[PDB]
Amino acid sequence: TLHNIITDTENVQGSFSKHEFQAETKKLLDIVARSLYSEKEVFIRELISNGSDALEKLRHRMITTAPMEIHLQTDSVKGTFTIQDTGVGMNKEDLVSNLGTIARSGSKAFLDSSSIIGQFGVGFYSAFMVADKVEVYSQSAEAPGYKWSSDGSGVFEVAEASGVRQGTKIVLHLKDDCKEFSSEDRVKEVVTKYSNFVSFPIFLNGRRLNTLQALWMMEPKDISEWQHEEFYRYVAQAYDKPRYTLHYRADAPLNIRSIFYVPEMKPSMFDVSRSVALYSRKILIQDILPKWLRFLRGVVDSEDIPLNLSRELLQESALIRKLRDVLQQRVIRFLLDQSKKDPEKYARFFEDYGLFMREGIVTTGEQSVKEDIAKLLRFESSALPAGQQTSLMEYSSRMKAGTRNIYYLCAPNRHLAEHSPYFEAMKQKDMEVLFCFEQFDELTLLHLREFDRKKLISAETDIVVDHYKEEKFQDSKPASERLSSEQAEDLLAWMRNALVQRVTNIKVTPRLDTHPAMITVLEMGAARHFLRTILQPTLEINTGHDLIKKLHALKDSNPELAQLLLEQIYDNAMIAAGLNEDPRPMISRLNQLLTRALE
Amino acid sequence: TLHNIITDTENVQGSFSKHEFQAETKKLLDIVARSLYSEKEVFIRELISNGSDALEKLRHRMITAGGDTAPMEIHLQTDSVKGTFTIQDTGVGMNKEDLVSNLGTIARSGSKAFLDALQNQAEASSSIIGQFGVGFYSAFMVADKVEVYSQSAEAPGYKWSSDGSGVFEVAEASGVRQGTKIVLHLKDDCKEFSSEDRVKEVVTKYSNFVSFPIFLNGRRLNTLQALWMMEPKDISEWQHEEFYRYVAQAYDKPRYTLHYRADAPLNIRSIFYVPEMKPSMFDSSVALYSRKILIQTKATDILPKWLRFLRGVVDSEDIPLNLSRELLQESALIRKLRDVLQQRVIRFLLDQSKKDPEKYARFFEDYGLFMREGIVTTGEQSVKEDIAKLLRFESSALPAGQQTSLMEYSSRMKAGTRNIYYLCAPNRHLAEHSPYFEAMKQKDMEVLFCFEQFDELTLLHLREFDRKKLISAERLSSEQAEDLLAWMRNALVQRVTNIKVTPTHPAMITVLEMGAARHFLRLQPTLEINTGHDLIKKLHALKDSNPELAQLLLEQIYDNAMIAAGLNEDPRPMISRLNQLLTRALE
Ligand SMILES: Nc1ncnc2c1ncn2[C@@H]1O[C@H](COP(=O)(O)OP(=O)(O)OP(=O)(O)O)[C@@H](O)[C@H]1O
Ligand SMILES: Nc1ncnc2c1ncn2[C@@H]1O[C@H](COP(=O)(O)OP(=O)(O)O)[C@@H](O)[C@H]1O
Ligand SMILES: [Co+2]
Ligand SMILES: [Co+2]
Ligand SMILES: [Co+2]
Ligand SMILES: [Co+2]
């Protein structure tokens, strides 16, 4: 039933010849020039890094004055890119060894700090992506200037040159394909993109470039609020200022140097339907954050993320997942700390960004992550004054020992919640009820399902499950102000005839006071969400209510007006339940009822 | 104020000394083994691709040599006790010379030299995957020891073995089957590749559409056919639906299918799907392949951003690949492909609106936000008007629910008409009663009614379409009303500031500026009263007789008009008060 050809049948015969790996050098040069880097512009990043390393070496040799800088020159008339650094330079041996040998890195044998970028020994050859001819003038410290020249076809020549300034100058005779790198504006774009945090001054055609400090690598105390505003505007390409700043450093289990910002501007709803930069040794390298935290701006840097040869890919997908989980938990802890510090400011944050907390809860499969994010949610309570926000953890700490459920109610505003027909039935019990006003709060709590091993249950659902338990409820009005059992059952029989296929059951409830009726569905939250795109509703009436009392008299007094009224009582309860369809078609019927009621 | 040190001051003194470029082979071996890819699991994709190429070379030789139609298979075996991963193909194999040359030399590609000598039309020219010469070394990322047994089809078997540290060994071996067998002794941290389920995940991810059958521990894996390589007619509708669910990881059906084949600027065999299900807040896309091997599960450079709602596959045998085989090189051919594909999809969707306008109306309802996003995002005015051909709006000349396009409108204009006008309103009731729509109606003419979100932002960025700019268009006696008017103006001073009289519904709400209406749905309405309605003449009578009932009645007339104007879709705040009004009315 299985088809396998792999069997241990091979046996070594005689001696073995030992060999050594070889390399096709000319083929390797073509690979680096045509297939290594996915974008041609990164040759500027490679040459600047080499200039930075050469300067870092000279700075190290200054322990035993001279200017230490990088100069870029573009000539559109001759189509040349030129970079010159004032670093250690290279002698006759170093030019042949370092530049002539692929994968040979002098920056490897130099050790023996953490300010060197090169390690692979191939980055220099990126110049042959954009240039047909490359000239290198190098003058070593102490040390006879030499000129290195090649075309990238597998051969180079070296001759002694005079008048070579200390350091190294490299001239790229650009191909006709890549004349854009003889443009000053284009070259300045690439420098700002990849090399904006170099530790040495960079000059472009005589003008000094506005390099920045890598704030994420600095001590948080040495960073002012003004410095964070400037950095936020650069990394987020924004014009405002951050309302929250998280500067997170860690060394275990992973190296982390990061800064996250929350914009003071509210998120654009156009951009929400359609964020953080990753760096290494202060060079841009472009997953890191969960989807629901995409509203964060800033920078993440981790020495534990290996880069591929082209310096544009991350190699440890298991570490990125682990990094993302660490960052996620650190942001949750930070946001909770903002709630306790300034709850008024956090109330505006949750109002502008709370939608991301709800998305994260709905789209996550891990229950512990759902509950971690749910700690950020804020609601009102029936046990607290109006306007005072609370949380699920604060609700849990008020629960008695004998309770195992968290009750909530979803209504547009505080007044509708306090005077809801579903909260009137809950007042007969002595449980606290969360008041949730946001449009997607019910969907969120439905996906959350439980918090701290306590089941979430809506007021509407609990009212229906009480029907299948004990009738432990008393009417808010004495029996003298309600219909008798003969009168109520006579009314219920008429209602079932006038509302055949519209309702499943009609019953009298002793749990209402101000409202004449209500609609109950066991899975009310799921019905309200499905309506965002004829079910089996139950109509529960208040026989103590004057409007219901008048309905019983109208079915014999004015039978046609009584049916018109019954339809409006049903519609009012459907609207109040959040289960109404289009409210426009009922306005025509309601105006007809108002004229007839007013004689 | 300038400071430049770059000056032409160098002059060569002496003679040149010529040298050839070198390679530090031991360091380079390490670079190509672990520094090329983003995932170490890639060694499985590389070794299966190499075995496919060996099988392809064997199939090509048999066109002339005429073998016997050997099995031609790829077999994988895992051993979780010894920690080994084994792959064997029944392909063309390698003698001792080819083992030392191909395996021992970095960037040496025998498949590349095979491709160069083939006739450019031969079948094997478009299906051989190798070219770089480094893919095999990815095994040393996951293995401390690599052994290769190979038997060529000529005349002796050989064993090639190495640890990946500069040297390798070659010896004669007996019992070596025709083809190549590679045994990887997995490192401790890469033991997962000795697990059957893990190997099956990698094969499915990258090599699911390899031509030749693939066996794992005696069980077949690649059962799916590359549908994009077939003739569009020879593909039935049920095959597209089943292939769509696989490529899109979906569970519905495609509402639109575009099977696109072309040869310029690149060879392209592609299949695009539009899902039948709407996008949701809780949330793959078009994958890129090359010679049946996955390059990117989410292609980035081939389609514009606004077409990210499309699902499916694009395969190109000659697109310039990055060394990592998970990226594309920067190429003018790839930039032209994106423009060709953009025009192709636009044309396809335009043909669907002619083929089935009702079905296209449902499509534009679900995915119109991507058309609108495309017009705002792109910078070329020519592609703005191309995407604008897909836009649909309502009109004042057509009844409600009927749609028209910008081209399906520039025709019905008058002869001397260089302008076209639109009105972005929440709904039709507000648009038909907009004071600016009356002005655009007195001078004949017709206004587009735009109700969708960002419809205003779309037409503003559109500026001009079809060489024509888009310019926004922005019984009760004789005088018993003022006694009711001034009473109505006073009872709701905080809601409206203008209450008029206009000759079913007792009253209606109108809004002056439409920009203020959408701000309210996230203003100053004009309550227009009719003197002839019963509730209005009843409100005038109850005004002084029953003041409590008159206040509840006025509030209900106001709220009912707000509902009829679409400015109140959740009438929950009124239910309790309406119940009090009904009770006091039926005394
Ligand atoms: N501007 C320079 N001045 C002095 N020495 C240099 C300069 N550029 C390169 N070198 C030397 O030549 C060597 C060639 O480096 P190459 O750019 O090929 O790779 P790398 O920078 O060592 O490593 P990577 O490939 O990771 O960038 C370097 O190790 C360095 O020692
Ligand atoms: N069965 C086989 N498995 C792997 N390589 C083989 C096989 N038969 C022949 N070869 C040769 O080994 C060479 C090494 O290829 P590799 O280093 O992976 O780079 P590429 O695949 O791009 O040529 C191939 O070009 C191919 O000619
Ligand atoms: Co054995
Ligand atoms: Co307690
Ligand atoms: Co000169
Ligand atoms: Co040819």
From TrEMBL, chain B:
CDD domains: HATPase_Hsp90-like. Mg(2+) 1 binds at residues 46, 50. Transmembrane segments: none annotated. Disulfide bonds join 424-450. Ca(2+) 2 binds at residues 102, 108, 133, 137. Mg(2+) 2 binds at residue 50. GO terms for biological process: protein folding. It comes from the Eukaryota. Ca(2+) 1 binds at residues 102, 105, 108, 133. Gene3D superfamilies: 3.30.230.80, 3.40.50.11260, Heat shock protein 90, C-terminal domain, Histidine kinase-like ATPase, C-terminal domain. Residues 39-190 form the Histidine kinase/HSP90-like ATPase domain. It holds the Pfam family HATPase_c_3. Keywords: Acetylation, ATP-binding, Calcium, Chaperone, Membrane, Metal-binding, Mitochondrion, Mitochondrion inner membrane, Nucleotide-binding, Phosphoprotein, Receptor, Stress response, Transit peptide. Chaperone that expresses an ATPase activity. Involved in maintaining mitochondrial function and polarization, downstream of PINK1 and mitochondrial complex I. Is a negative regulator of mitochondrial respiration able to modulate the balance between oxidative phosphorylation and aerobic glycolysis. The impact of TRAP1 on mitochondrial respiration is probably mediated by modulation of mitochondrial SRC and inhibition of SDHA. Binds to the intracellular domain of tumor necrosis factor type 1 receptor. Binds to RB1. Interacts with SRC. Interacts with SDHA. Belongs to the heat shock protein 90 family. This is Heat shock protein 75 kDa, mitochondrial. The lineage of its organism: Eukaryota, Metazoa, Chordata, Craniata, Vertebrata.
